[PDB]
Amino acid sequence: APAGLEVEPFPIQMQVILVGTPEAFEGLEEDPAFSELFRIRAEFSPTLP
Amino acid sequence: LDPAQWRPNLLTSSSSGTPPPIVYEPYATAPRLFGRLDYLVDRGVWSTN
Amino acid sequence: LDPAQWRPNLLTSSSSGTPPPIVYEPYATAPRLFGRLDYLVDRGVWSTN
Numbered sequence: 001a002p003a004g005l006e007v008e009p010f011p012i013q014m015q016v017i018l019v020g021t022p023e024a025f026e027g028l029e030e031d032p033a034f035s036e037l038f039r040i041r042a043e044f045s046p047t048l049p
Numbered sequence: 050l051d052p053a054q055w056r057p058n059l060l061t062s063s064s065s066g067t068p069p070p071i072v073y074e075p076y077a078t079a080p081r082l083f084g085r086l087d088y089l090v091d092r093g094v095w096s097t098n
Numbered sequence: 099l100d101p102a103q104w105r106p107n108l109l110t111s112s113s114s115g116t117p118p119p120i121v122y123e124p125y126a127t128a129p130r131l132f133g134r135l136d137y138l139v140d141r142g143v144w145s146t147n
Contacts, residue, residue, distance in 0.1 A: 001088060002095050002139035010060075010084070014070075094141050 054098045060084075103147040109133070 018028075018038060028034055064070050074081055088097045113119045123130060137146045 001086075001097060003136065005086065005097060007086070095139065 051098070100147070 016038070022043070061070070086097060088095060090096075135146060137144055139145075
């Protein structure tokens, strides 16, 4: 872009819910911010009674 | 006066909140996550609004 | 005469010192820390002031 637009950043009012396999979340849980941001762990039991 | 440059970009229609806005990105890329800004090319002249 | 090339570029604002000017960068890079010089493209011609 030549100068583009000076866009004001969009406010975030959502609740981000990331869904993945247990081995997928090692790659994202080395960051201290990850515990700070995503702090509820809804872990799915791979079996049911 | 350019009508396109002075029209309020209604990003998303007003939601009643029941059900709340539920959006899932199977393919999460920065243009798809944060949105993007498009442009026009007029004889090699690069512009946007 | 181009008056756009002779503005007093106030890179700061008058601070009373109470509270002291406090700036924190969540992430810091060279353009964010030291500032950057912008350029404008006129039909393909690079310019700056």
